[PDB]
Design a protein around this ligand. Structure first.
Ligand SMILES: COc1ccc(NC(=S)NCCCn2ccnc2)cc1OC
Ligand SMILES: [Zn+2]
Length: 309
């Protein structure tokens, strides 16, 4: 089910690039390492923004303390589920923490990693609010869930035990909570789409999981179409972002604890990584706004086709 063209143009017209940039992105671009005041302030900002949406999302924190290389630290995942009555949901996810670096440099704000992914989820929820509201009122069978995960990044060196604090905790939590039909909230996740490392110029994505390749092909088909319809900028070839063929390698990320429990995953991560990755230069001024908005348009069409909005 692809959107009719006139309806596609209306959905793209519901996006507001200034809102995405100023209302959703800019407030995130602060140091927000786990346990920090700035991380708490970004967590509160995400929650209050999500609760304001007219669709009436269920918004809850998953708070926990875990041992880290810095000692005990408190983490909190933000979990927004549009209709908690629904059997299942499309889940879109990203991490809202920023990686800790030691004092004495320009502060690391992780603009691509992952402030842009967070702002994209907020803008999609806002831009499709009316249709999401009306689909919930119709008791649609598949709802939408947005996860803003804390503690993706290593606190002092990446490995199985110093990374993915929020996603490890949340997948285990969901496994422990019954859901109908379920039998647990893990089985309610129909597709887990993880956005990471977005906003740099010239991203390239590959399909990381054969099991979900049909959704990857759908994103490619949407890129192609929007290009044809003169709705992408700085996009001189038909297919630039969604590359065919095998990936250059897999990337450990917040999907792992869900993948291991049998959840279907699509990993929407640029590979190669942004040039600025894990340097202090991963900032607003180094983002490529036309690429951010192109990605937002592709995702908005994807979301509207996936949920029948
Ligand atoms: C510089 O290019 C790379 C460096 C390392 C890896 N390998 C892994 S397993 N990375 C895990 C990344 C986790 N993450 C996501 C966001 N911030 C951190 C791959 C890279 O290019 C494909
Ligand atoms: Zn990172």
């Amino acid at each position: 089910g692809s959107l009719p063209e006139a309806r596609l143009r209306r959905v793209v017209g519901q996006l507001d690039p200034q809102r995405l940039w100023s209302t959703y992105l800019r407030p995130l671009l602060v140091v927000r390492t786990p346990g920090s005041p700035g991380n708490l302030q970004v967590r509160k900002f995400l929650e209050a923004t999500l609760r304001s949406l007219t669709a009436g999302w269920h918004v809850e924190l998953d708070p926990f303390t875990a041992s880290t290389p810095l000692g005990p630290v408190d983490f909190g995942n933000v979990v927004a589920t549009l209709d908690p009555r629904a059997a299942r949901h499309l889940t879109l996810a990203c991490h809202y923490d920023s990686k800790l670096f030691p004092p004495g440099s320009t502060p690391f704000v992780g603009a691509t990693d992952s402030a842009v992914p967070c702002a994209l989820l907020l803008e999609l929820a806002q831009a499709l609010d009316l249709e999401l509201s009306r689909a919930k009122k119709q008791a649609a069978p598949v709802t939408l869930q947005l996860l803003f995960l804390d503690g993706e990044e290593a606190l002092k060196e990446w490995g199985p035990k110093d990374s993915l604090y929020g996603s490890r905790h949340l997948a285990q939590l969901m496994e422990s909570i019954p859901h109908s039909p379920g039998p647990t909230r893990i089985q309610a996740i129909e597709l887990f789409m993880l956005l990471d490392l977005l906003g740099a110029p010239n991203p390239t994505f590959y399909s990381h999981f054969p099991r979900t390749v049909r959704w990857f092909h759908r994103l490619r088909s949407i890129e192609k179409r929007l290009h044809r319809l003169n709705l992408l900028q700085s996009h001189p070839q038909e297919v630039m972002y969604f590359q065919p063929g095998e990936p250059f390698g897999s990337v450990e990320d917040d999907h792992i604890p869900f993948l291991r429990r049998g959840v279907p995953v699509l990993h929407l991560i640029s590979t190669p990584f942004p040039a600025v990755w894990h340097t202090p230069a991963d900032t607003e001024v180094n983002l490529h706004p036309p690429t951010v908005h192109n990605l937002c348009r592709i995702l908005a069409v994807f979301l509207a086709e996936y949920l029948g909005l």
